[PDB]
Motif scaffolding. Structure first.
Motif, PDB file in Angstrom:
ATOM      1  N   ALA A 235       0.818  -1.207   0.000  1.00 24.46           N
ATOM      2  CA  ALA A 235       0.000   0.000   0.000  1.00 24.46           C
ATOM      3  C   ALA A 235       0.855   1.261   0.000  1.00 24.46           C
ATOM      4  N   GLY A 236       2.095   1.166   0.478  1.00 18.84           N
ATOM      5  CA  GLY A 236       2.956   2.312   0.651  1.00 18.84           C
ATOM      6  C   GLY A 236       3.105   2.791   2.081  1.00 18.84           C
ATOM      7  N   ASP A 237       2.299   2.274   3.016  1.00 20.75           N
ATOM      8  CA  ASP A 237       2.308   2.735   4.401  1.00 20.75           C
ATOM      9  C   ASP A 237       2.783   1.663   5.380  1.00 20.75           C
ATOM     10  N   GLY A 238       3.396   0.593   4.889  1.00 26.74           N
ATOM     11  CA  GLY A 238       3.777  -0.531   5.718  1.00 26.74           C
ATOM     12  C   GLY A 238       2.782  -1.680   5.726  1.00 26.74           C
ATOM     13  N   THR A 239       1.643  -1.533   5.074  1.00 21.62           N
ATOM     14  CA  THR A 239       0.666  -2.603   4.949  1.00 21.62           C
ATOM     15  C   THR A 239       0.555  -3.034   3.488  1.00 21.62           C
ATOM     16  N   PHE A 240      -0.287  -4.032   3.237  1.00 28.42           N
ATOM     17  CA  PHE A 240      -0.317  -4.688   1.941  1.00 28.42           C
ATOM     18  C   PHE A 240      -1.755  -4.891   1.502  1.00 28.42           C
ATOM     19  N   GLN A 241      -1.901  -5.203   0.217  1.00 32.21           N
ATOM     20  CA  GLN A 241      -3.187  -5.350  -0.451  1.00 32.21           C
ATOM     21  C   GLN A 241      -3.127  -6.533  -1.398  1.00 32.21           C
TER      22      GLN A 241
END
Lengths: 273, 9, 98
Positions: A235-241
Motif C-alpha cells: 500500500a505504501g504505508d507498511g501494509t499490503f493489499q
C-alpha cells in the motif's frame, strides 16, 4: 517467527562506469536500511524509525561495510565474466540474499547466504552452514576459492551469532511496528461483464504481515481453475493489499463466498455478495 | 546489521 | 534470462473524490532491474514521483513501488507508463479505481 534478510544487487554497465551496488535490509516485511553506491555521498540510510536512533558508530560501521561490499562485488562481477567467457560489452547482475530465520522459540532456525548471476542460482551456503552447493562449473570455481579461504566459517559466525543478535535487538526496539498484526479489511466488488456475467472481486486491504490467502468458493468447492489472483502489493504505508476475482453467471452471485485467512484475523472470515 | 565482507566470487 | 514486469496501478486507500491519497505503480517479477516507470495524469508525466529501493523476491526477480501524493477527482484520468527490455514499446496501464 521472524527473519532478518539482506538483499544485494550489483549491476555492471560497460562503457558507463563502475558497477552499481545496491543493498536493502528487511525485518520480516519491513525495510529498515538502504545503501546505493551511486548516490552523491553513499551512506547507509535508515528506512525505519527503530534504527534511526542508533548512534553514529552504528551507522558509520554499516556504511563502511556496504562500501567494502560494493568494491568486493566489482571484483566478483569481473571474475564471473571471465569464468563464463562472456564478452566485455554485456551488462550483468550479481545478486546476494542472506539472513537468519528465527523460530517460535526465539532461536535460530535457518541461516542462509546465496547468490545469483544474471537471475539464475549460482552458489548457496547449505543449511549446515559449512558446505556450498554450486549450480554450474563456473560456480565450482567460486566453491573451491571459498573452501580454500574458509569463507563458510566466517559466514556461519555472522549467521549464528551477530545476525540473530541484531534481529533480536530490532524486534525489541521496533516492537510497536514489527511485533504487531494488522488484520485485513475486506469487501467484495461487483462488475457487470455483460447482461449474462459479472466479476466478483474479493479484496483484502491494509494488512500486515504480507502473508495471506484469498479463496473463492461456490456452495462449498474451491474455485481454483477460475480464480484470478494478483500478487500481494504494498500500500505504501507498511501494509499490503491483494485481490481475488471470479466471473460468475448473472443471478448466481449469491452462491459464491470469498474466504480470507490472515494472522491478524480474530475468527474465520467469510464474504458473500 | 550487515555481514562483513569476505572473498570475491 | 529476461522476465517481463507485472504492473498494477492503484491507490493507497479507496479513492474518494477530493481527499488526499497516494497513487501507486507496483512493478514486480522483472529481470534485469533497469526499468523506466512514469505516473501520468491526463496523459502528462507527473513530476515529483518517488520510488522504493530496488529489492528482489525469492525467485531473484525485482520489484519497485512508484508513488505520488494525489487527490482524485471525478474528471482526472491516471495511468502508469513502463518500459523494460522485455517490452517492444512502452506499456501503459490505466488506473481503474477497482
Amino acid at each position: 517467527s521472524h527473519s532478518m534478510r539482506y538483499f544485494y544487487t550489483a549491476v555492471s554497465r560497460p562503457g558507463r562506469g563502475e558497477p552499481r551496488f545496491i543493498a536493502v535490509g528487511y525485518v520480516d516485511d519491513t525495510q529498515f536500511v538502504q545503501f546505493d553506491s551511486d548516490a552523491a555521498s553513499p551512506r547507509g540510510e535508515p528506512r525505519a524509525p527503530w534504527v534511526e536512533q542508533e548512534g553514529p558508530e552504528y551507522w558509520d560501521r554499516e556504511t563502511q561495510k556496504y562500501k567494502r561490499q560494493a568494491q568486493t562485488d566489482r571484483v566478483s562481477l569481473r571474475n564471473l565474466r571471465g569464468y563464463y567467457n562472456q564478452s566485455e560489452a554485456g551488462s550483468h547482475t550479481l545478486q546476494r540474499m542472506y539472513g537468519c530465520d528465527l523460530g517460535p522459540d526465539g532461536r535460530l532456525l535457518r541461516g542462509y547466504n546465496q547468490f545469483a548471476y544474471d537471475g539464475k542460482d549460482y552458489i548457496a551456503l547449505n543449511e549446515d552452514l559449512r558446505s556450498w552447493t554450486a549450480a554450474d562449473k563456473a560456480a565450482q570455481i567460486t566453491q573451491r576459492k571459498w573452501e580454500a579461504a574458509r569463507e563458510a566459517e566466517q559466514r556461519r559466525a555472522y549467521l549464528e551469532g551477530t545476525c540473530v543478535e541484531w534481529l533480536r535487538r530490532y524486534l525489541e526496539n521496533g516492537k510497536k511496528t514489527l511485533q504487531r498484526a494488522e488484520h485485513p479489511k475486506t469487501h467484495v466488488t461487483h462488475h457487470p461483464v455483460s447482461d449474462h456475467e459479472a466479476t466478483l472481486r474479493c479484496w483484502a486491504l491494509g494488512f500486515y504481515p504480507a502473508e495471506i490467502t484469498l479463496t473463492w468458493q461456490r456452495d462449498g468447492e474451491d474455485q481454483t481453475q477460475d480464480t484470478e489472483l494478483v500478487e500481494t502489493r504494498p500500500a505504501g504505508d507498511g501494509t499490503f493489499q491483494k485481490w481475488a476475482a471470479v466471473v460468475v453467471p448473472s443471478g448466481e452471485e449469491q452462491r459464491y463466498t470469498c474466504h480470507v485467512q490472515h494472522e491478524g484475523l480474530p475468527e474465520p472470515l467469510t464474504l458473500r455478495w | 546489521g550487515a555481514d562483513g565482507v569476505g572473498k570475491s566470487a | 534470462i529476461q522476465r517481463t514486469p507485472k504492473i498494477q496501478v492503484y491507490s493507497r486507500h479507496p479513492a474518494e473524490n477530493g481527499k488526499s491519497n497516494f497513487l501507486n505503480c507496483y512493478v514486480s517479477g522483472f529481470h534485469p532491474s533497469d526499468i523506466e516507470v512514469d505516473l501520468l495524469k491526463n496523459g502528462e508525466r507527473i513530476e515529483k514521483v518517488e520510488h522504493s529501493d530496488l529489492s528482489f523476491s525469492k525467485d531473484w526477480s525485482f520489484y519497485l513501488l512508484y508513488y505520488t501524493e494525489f487527490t482524485p477527482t471525478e474528471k482526472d484520468e491516471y495511468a502508469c507508463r513502463v518500459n523494460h527490455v522485455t517490452l517492444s514499446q512502452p506499456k501503459i496501464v490505466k488506473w481503474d479505481r477497482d
